[PDB]
Design a protein around this nucleic acid. Sequence first.
DNA 1: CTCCGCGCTGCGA
DNA 2: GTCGCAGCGC
Length: 631
Amino acid sequence: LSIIDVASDQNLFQTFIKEWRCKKRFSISLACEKIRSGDDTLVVGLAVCWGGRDAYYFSLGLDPSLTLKDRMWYLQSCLRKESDKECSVVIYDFIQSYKILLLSCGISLEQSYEDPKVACWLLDPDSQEPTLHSIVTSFLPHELPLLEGMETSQGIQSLGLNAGSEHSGRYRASVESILIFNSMNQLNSLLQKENLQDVFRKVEMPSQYCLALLELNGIGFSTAECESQKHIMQAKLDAIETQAYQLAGHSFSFTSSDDIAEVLFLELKLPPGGQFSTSKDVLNKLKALHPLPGLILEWRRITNAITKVVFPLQREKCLNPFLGMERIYPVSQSHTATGRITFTEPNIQNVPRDFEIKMGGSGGMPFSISMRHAFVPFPGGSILAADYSQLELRILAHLSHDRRLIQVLNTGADVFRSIAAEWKMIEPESVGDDLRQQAKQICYGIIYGMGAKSLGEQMGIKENDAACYIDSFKSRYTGINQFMTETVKNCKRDGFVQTILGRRRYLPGIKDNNPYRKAHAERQAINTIVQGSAADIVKIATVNIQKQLETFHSTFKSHGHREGMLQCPIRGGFFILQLHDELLYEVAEEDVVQVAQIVKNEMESAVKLSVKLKVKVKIGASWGELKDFDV
DNA sequence: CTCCGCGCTGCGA
DNA sequence: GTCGCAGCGC
Ligand SMILES: CN1CCN(c2cc(C(F)(F)F)cc(C(F)(F)F)c2OC(=O)N(C)c2ccc(F)cc2)C1=O
Ligand SMILES: Nc1nc2c(ncn2[C@H]2CC[C@@H](COP(=O)(O)OP(=O)(O)OP(=O)(O)O)O2)c(=O)[nH]1
Ligand SMILES: [Mg+2]
């Protein structure tokens, strides 16, 4: 290809800037390499392509008159949008590039963004995580020999951003620039064909921008809170070990399923219930007989909490010197089958719910272990959690129009406490969090295709009894099953399911021969038709909330922006985490009211349904100590 | 072979 | 290493 080193002659550089200021669409690729003496990232330059196999390299490390500050001035001049300039930038791994640009160059991009990976996921949510090699092979094969010059393109990291390759930063960035530009033109052609370009440019890419702002913010984390909770949990763990070995007369292994099987079903004559299964469903039923199953469940819960939540967060914590805080910086991921947004490194979505452990000799003492309490706002701030009240159920009500579901939605009573009251034959006010959560699983499973076998095994009852429960549900809420049958019919005639925004989940297995294959495909259809719609509504809410918060301004978009500027008082909302039906923000005090009215008004007014979207706003000094807000 | 769904992560074979 | 299993979250 033609790599044009624009920063080599002054006339060449000025003509390059002249041409660049005319373009309405161009690709961008950062050129990161190693710090000579160790190994760390260093932005050596950048690459721009606006057509053909020509990549313009903007060196940032040889006309001496082009001082680096002049180059940065022209860079910010070309990268910042103005009034109705309608520029569309194309970058691979848009969030990482935005973060690295803002943090290593002080450049806040303001143009419209187009990511090829997001387009690939939109065309097929079940597709593998797109790599530059995969995109080039599937959409721009004739230029694949370019990537044949190396093997780094086989990774999800940007080729130009991958400093590990023996190739130079310039060559990698140039190749990525041209390839991403042309492959994005092809992907845009396909998206326009399938009427999904709108959802790509108005919902998904702005959501990626909000995700980048979140990742720049990071969630605050208190280490002393984690220390205290971990000490209590380890004390209770040792107590559980000693008490269980006393109750068993010998030392078993809580991980060894055969050890506990021998202890329960043989040494203690506990009734099996094919048999000799030490699963959670069987131990929950056996808890009502001997204390040891409950102790094993508590041991497993505490061990999971302290090995898969405590230590990862304690290792992933970083100091934010400008804020005087210790924040956790997770990574976003939207490449999911149903459009939901998950997190990684660490998954602060999987933080355990609030549970209690009783310690003491005479009946113990209650000690609440809320791991979500170690997440706190900045000094003088407030965590603000806005939750969609029964989002998927309202979506199913708008779809199926089963008047019983609409009625029980209008009544305003916990349908899971209702299930548990019909289940255990108790009062709904007596249903605790554990039993209500079991009932929530029962509810959503039965709605999405739970079998009588698993329903009975979880309910602690027989198969033919859970069958009666399923038939009762189907007789009561009839429009739901009518719409489920219509959905399998539509996905069988069409071969795919379509969410509310028009996204497509391609499920060919709905016409498979194996009954399990067909059943799983039908269940995936009936699930995704609602789950992806919920994710889409959450995304629309998020992007409108961010736009509204940016309207009032007098506020830094992300934290990263404000610490980059400092190198000022905090005053505004800050995206920190997104539960799949609930948004979390970190609002400064003076705005905890205003921002709240922004989150509730947008979330309610994110999409028009036959059932109004109910939102519940809570404010607190931590994600664990949240109390309802007025708004 | 085998019957709610989406997701992550540590440990073990 | 790679993946499966089982723990948890929505
Ligand atoms: C009069 N009650 C109480 C609860 N409930 C209900 C409501 C919904 C919803 F979401 F549409 F409102 C769903 C379910 C089901 F079946 F999906 F779990 C519901 O439970 C059922 O109907 N049964 C038959 C049921 C009850 C307890 C179980 F252990 C299993 C099944 C009612 O209608
Ligand atoms: N298919 C399925 N979906 C689930 C399951 N648990 C949660 N979800 C989905 C559907 C509801 C949504 C929100 O989860 P919550 O646990 O926050 O549930 P909720 O019923 O919306 O509200 P609440 O906060 O009152 O418990 O996530 C589950 O076991 N199966
Ligand atoms: Mg909820």
